[PDB]
């Protein structure tokens with residue numbers, strides 16, 4: 001049996017039309033062209049002999065406008081202003097992007113899903129979706145040249161940009177910047193190995209996945225037994241789970257299935273000790289990479 | 303540790319610009335507008351009281367050109383010709399799509415991956431990737447109104463359309479048409495429960511995933527022991543695996559890792575009996591949803 005769940009990304013065309021290439025004579029990476037601004041990682045300024053401890057303030061002053069070459073392949077855009085905001089550059093260009101979508105900037109929270117457009121040399125090459133992990137990394141797929149690839153959510157026609165790719169950690173996961181220039185987590189945009197915080201299971205997404213199972217007629221793990229949210233969250237802190245915070249999206253799943261949240265918090269406690277050979281939606285481990293909204297949308301059509 | 307593998311779709315913008323809505327006064331579904339042609343499922347002609355046993359030949363003759371209303375939301379396209387090819391309609395329209403990409407039609411083979419653009423009422427809503435299963439179904443995510451959603455691969459700038467969505471089977475999987483109008487597998491485009499063939503593990507993709515593990519420093523399952531392709535394929539037939547056929551993509555992985563294909567065919571035989579508590583890339587079961595090409599591209603940058 002198939003659950004009807006896939007890793008679903010937004011259609012990428014609106015964002016594809018915003019991707020450019022940015023070069024300072026060192027690395028070439030990607031930028032995001034909205035209105036008269038091009039956003040890109042500030043380490044485009046860094047020579048390779050300084051990637052481990054750049055002085056970005058001095059690099060910024062050493063640049064002039066025409067130090068930045070911005071090109072669109074899928075135009076040449078003349079840079080007429082430059083500024084640094086945290087770990088990002090804000091380049092002002094002479095031409096407004098005629099395909100600028102309606103957009104906002106937002107920060108994505110752990111457990112929430114977003115779509116990534118992986119680009120190299122200004123050329124979109126693939127799209128995928130990830131959830132922001134509790135330790136502010138993502139389990140992505142990025143190679144040399146991908147920095148400046150962007151992540152986003154979409155509300156109606158409005159694209160909410162939330163991520164600009166910066167680096168890969170030694171454990172293969174990834175992190176980047178929000179468009180206020182902050183790195184997600186405690187990470188720095190310097191080529192040195194960094195403290196990595198412990199990851200956790202995202203409890204609300206595990207609950208969503210158990211609801212997805214019920215919605216597929218798979219409910220062997222449901223018992224009348226219940227664990228309260230407060231009791232579950234005390235347990236969570238000692239067992240590598242995030243604290244559970246319910247939402248309207250989760251409540252819709254409880255209403256549709258007739259199964260209470262607290263029944264699934266009990267189920268999680270028991271399943272975490274082991275599935276005892278049984279499977280849920282073809283898996284022998286808890287799944288936390290699907291959100292309540294994924295389940296509402298993909299299965300219930302909401 | 304994260305493998306660096308995600309479910310990666312092509313960027314969808316080129317195909318988004320080809321999607322339209324098609325209505326006959328009964329259901330509304332999606333069509334694909336290339337040059338002066340709109341392709342769509344032929345059950346757009348079917349009234350709901352006949353979805354279980356349509357006479358499509360008589361339905362086709364009962365239609366005239368202006369019976370078909372074709373609309374683009376993301377134009378009204380006047381239909382000036384109509385024809386049926388297998389399970390698809392080929393509508394000729396008065397305007398050539400100015401955003402027609404370079405394209406071909408192809409049939410996708412079991413184990414191969416392709417990108418899907420899920421659409422409703424002519425509006426793209428998400429994208430995902432699937433592998434064609436050995437029983438000619440896909441494990442997709444489709445709801446009422448999604449028929450006419452398209453699947454494709456991409457070679458350079460050329461989009462190879464391979465799938466037009468038609469139906470969901472009782473086990474939650476999906477199937478559809480190639481653009482020669484044939485349904486994948488033995489399926490018919492009639493709303494009746496149908497014989498479903500047994501699925502199998504795609505051996506070449508399991509081998510690719512074991513190579514992905516090695517490429518991530520995870521090689522506990524590699525032994526000098528070897529099983530030949532011919533011996534493995536005899537075993538495969540009795541154990542719910544496809545017969546293995548090597549390719550240049552797999553050979554590149556063997557060269558990069560120094561691990562022979564036959565070592566991994568032996569590994570699969572042993573792992574299929576059980577992982578004995580150990581995990582591979584965070585999984586306790588064999589993974590066959592990633593192709594040799596996925597691994598070459600996402601991990602090796604080829």
Ligand SMILES: *[C@@H](O)[C@H](C[C@@H]1CCNC1=O)NC(=O)[C@H](CC(C)C)NC(=O)OC[C@@H]1C[C@@H]1CCC
Pocket residue numbers: 029043051052142143144145146147148166167168169170174188189190191192193
């Ligand atoms: C984009 O420039 C690039 C994206 C990385 C490359 C490989 N996979 C990625 O996601 N980013 C970088 O190369 C980083 C530049 C610094 C200055 C922010 N560095 C980086 O990601 O280093 C990764 C290697 C694993 C070790 C960690 C740092 C010692």
Ligand SMILES: *[C@@H](O)[C@H](C[C@@H]1CCNC1=O)NC(=O)[C@H](CC(C)C)NC(=O)OC[C@@H]1C[C@@H]1CCC
Pocket residue numbers: 331345353354444445446447448449450468469470471472476490491492493494495
């Ligand atoms: C598009 O029109 C639609 C797509 C289905 C709807 C629900 N999920 C899908 O993928 N296709 C249909 O409704 C099919 C039309 C026939 C005439 C080809 N029918 C169909 O998919 O029926 C599905 C229900 C599960 C039972 C199987 C048939 C008895």
